[PDB]
């Protein structure tokens, strides 16, 4: 996160650290959607151009954290991955469309004050909130600057920008499964997600039932916080039915 603040303890209880076994390293952010399921970005597991292709056995999921590096002794819970599922139409070859992956845990995690699942949006929630100028919130242990590392979890509140705008900001082809967010150079407020933040949650709070909803997944952007550029997220409501298929086809 660039230009954010440290997270309050217990503020984003669905945040998950995607952690690799060796070198012991932070690989990405993520979110807990139930007690056996985590959602992240498929770029986190598979990215051939970069020679990236991680298996269940290459990683751990760390849930309950605030500190980035320390091991949070009676606070964080560590899980082993049972199976990984990437969207069959993840397009890593051109614009990363359908960047989403499900991970199913070897055993369900117990909730606590620091471990709690985010809600998945329904059609009406997606419908009222996902509007240009509404602010959502991104979190991660990621870079503080494009080109260092926080000690604890960062948070930033960013506005959903109008499509055209998103569209005229890059040479990359944008698809209906994407959304961009960030301030405009004129707004005189800034912040973005950055490297290390991928797979984290872009969540919103419902005014109607006052529940938090995961609306997007951290995906791509050019640089971190550049004036006239926006961060792109996977539109979670649009990939919603693939989500229910796998969980039904395979879990819970």
């Amino acid at each position: 996160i660039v230009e954010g603040s440290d997270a309050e303890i217990g503020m984003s209880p669905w945040q998950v650290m995607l952690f690799r076994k060796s070198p012991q390293e932070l690989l990405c952010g993520a979110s807990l959607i139930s007690d056996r399921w985590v959602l992240t970005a498929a770029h986190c597991l598979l990215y051939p151009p970069w020679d990236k292709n991680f298996t269940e056995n290459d990683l751990l999921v760390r849930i309950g954290k605030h500190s980035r590096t320390r091991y949070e002794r009676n606070i964080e819970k560590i899980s082993m991955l049972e199976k990984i599922y990437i969207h069959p139409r993840y397009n890593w070859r051109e614009n990363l469309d359908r960047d989403i992956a499900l991970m199913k845990l070897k055993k369900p995690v117990a909730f606590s004050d620091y471990i709690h699942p985010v809600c998945l949006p329904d059609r009406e929630t997606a419908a009222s909130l996902l509007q240009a100028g509404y602010k959502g919130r991104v979190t991660g242990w990621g870079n503080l600057k494009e080109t260092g590392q926080p000690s604890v979890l960062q948070v930033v509140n960013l506005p959903i920008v109008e499509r055209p705008v998103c569209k005229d900001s890059t040479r990359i082809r944008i698809t209906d499964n994407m959304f961009c967010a960030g301030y405009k150079p004129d707004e005189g407020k800034r912040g973005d997600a950055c490297e290390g933040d991928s797979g984290g949650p872009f969540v919103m709070k419902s005014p109607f039932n006052n529940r938090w909803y995961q609306m997007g997944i951290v995906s791509w952007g050019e640089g971190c916080d550049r004036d006239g550029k926006y961060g792109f997220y996977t539109h979670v409501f649009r990939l919603k039915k693939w989500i229910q298929k796998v969980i039904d086809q395979f879990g819970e």
Binding site: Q24, R70, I78
Partner: peptide, 8 residues
């Protein structure tokens, strides 16, 4: 990165 328990 602090050390994680090998049980894991």
């Amino acid at each position: 990165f602090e050390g994680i328990p090998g049980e894991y």
